[PDB]
Amino acid sequence: IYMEFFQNKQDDHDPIDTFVIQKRALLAQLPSGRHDEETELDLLFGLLNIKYRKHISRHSVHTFKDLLEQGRIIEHNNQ
Amino acid sequence: KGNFSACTHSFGGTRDHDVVEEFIGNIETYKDVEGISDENALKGISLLFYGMASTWWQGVRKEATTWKEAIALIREHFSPTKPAYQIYMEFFQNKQDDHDPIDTFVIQKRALLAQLPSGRHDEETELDLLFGLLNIKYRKHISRHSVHTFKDLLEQGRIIEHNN
Amino acid sequence: KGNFSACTHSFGGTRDHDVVEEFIGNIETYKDVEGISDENALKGISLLFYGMASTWWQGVRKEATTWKEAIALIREHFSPTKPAYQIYMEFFQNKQDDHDPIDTFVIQKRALLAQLPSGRHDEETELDLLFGLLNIKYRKHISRHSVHTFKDLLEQGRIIEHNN
Amino acid sequence: IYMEFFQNKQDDHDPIDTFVIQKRALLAQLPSGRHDEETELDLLFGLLNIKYRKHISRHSVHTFKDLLEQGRIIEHN
CA atoms within 13 A on the CB side of A35: 13
CA distance C73 to C81: 13
CA distance C140 to D72: 13
User: Chain D within 8 Å of A57 (Cβ-Cβ)?
Assistant: no
Mutation for testing the A interface, residue in C140, C156, C161, C164 having most A CBs under 10 Å? C164
CA distances from A62 to A17, A46, A70, B84, B120 (A): 17, 16, 12, 16, 19
Is D73 close to C143, i.e. CB distance below 8 A? yes
Query: What is the chain D residue with the closest CA to A69?
Result: D59
CA distance A41 to A58: 10
The backbone torsions φ and ψ at residue C115, rounded to the nearest 5 degrees and listed phi first, read -95, 0
CA distance B112 to B114: 6
Q: What is the largest CA-CA distance in chain C?
A: 62
Q: Are D46 and D70 in contact (CB under 8 A)?
A: no
Q: Are C1 and C35 in contact (CB under 8 A)?
A: yes
Structural determination approach: cryo-EM
3-state DSSP of B98-120? CCCCHHHHHHHHHHHCCCCCCCC
CA distance C14 to C16: 6
Interacting residues of B43 by C-beta distance below 8 A, sequence separation 6+: C29, C32, C33
Q: Are C104 and C83 in contact (CB under 8 A)?
A: no
Is B89 close to A46, i.e. CB distance below 8 A? yes
From D63's Cα to the closest Cα of chain A, the distance in A is 21
Phi-psi bin for D30: left (phi > 0), alpha (psi -120 to 50), beta? beta
CA distance A38 to B85: 12
User: Chain A within 8 Å of C162 (Cβ-Cβ)?
Assistant: no
CA distances from C164 to B83, B157, D48 (A): 10, 39, 29
CA atoms within 13 A on the CB side of D40: 17
The one-character DSSP state at B73 is H
Give residues 1 to 60 of B whose Cβ lies within 8 Å of C. 3-6, 40, 43-44, 46-47, 50, 52, 54-56, 58-59
User: Chain C within 8 Å of D73 (Cβ-Cβ)?
Assistant: yes
Interacting residues of C27 by C-beta distance below 8 A, sequence separation 6+: C9, C48
Q: Please state at what angle helix B52-60 crosses helix C102-112, rounded to 10 degrees.
A: 70
Run of H or E residues at B135: none
User: Chain C within 8 Å of A50 (Cβ-Cβ)?
Assistant: no
Tell me the Cα Rg of chain A.
13
From B102's Cα to the closest Cα of chain C, the distance in A is 32
CA distance A74 to C158: 27
Q: Are D56 and D71 in contact (CB under 8 A)?
A: yes
CA distance D13 to B106: 60
Which among B124, B94, B138 has a CA at the least distance from the CA of B112?
Answer: B94
Give residues 25 to 64 of D whose Cβ lies within 8 Å of A. 50, 53-54, 57
From A72's Cα to the closest Cα of chain D, the distance in A is 13
Last residue before each gap in chain A (C to N over 2.5 A): none
Run of H or E residues at B52: helix B52-60
User: CB C157: neighbour CB atoms within 10 A?
Assistant: 20
Run of H or E residues at C99: none
Q: Quote the distance between the C-alpha of residue D2 and its chain's center.
A: 15
Q: Any alpha helices (H) in C131-164, and if so which ranges?
A: 136-139, 150-163
CA distance B11 to B48: 7
Q: List subunits contacting chain D, requiring 3 or more Cβ pairs under 8 Å.
A: A, C
Q: Are D61 and D70 in contact (CB under 8 A)?
A: yes
To 5 degrees, how large is the angle CA B33–CA B35–CA B39?
130
User: Chain B within 8 Å of C88 (Cβ-Cβ)?
Assistant: no
CA distance A16 to A13: 9
The one-character DSSP state at B11 is B
CA distance B158 to B156: 5
The backbone torsions φ and ψ at residue A71, rounded to the nearest 5 degrees and listed phi first, read -70, -35
Which among A47, A40, A53, A39 has a CA at the least distance from the CA of A6?
Answer: A47
CA distance B76 to B161: 42
Q: Report resolution in angstroms.
A: 3.5
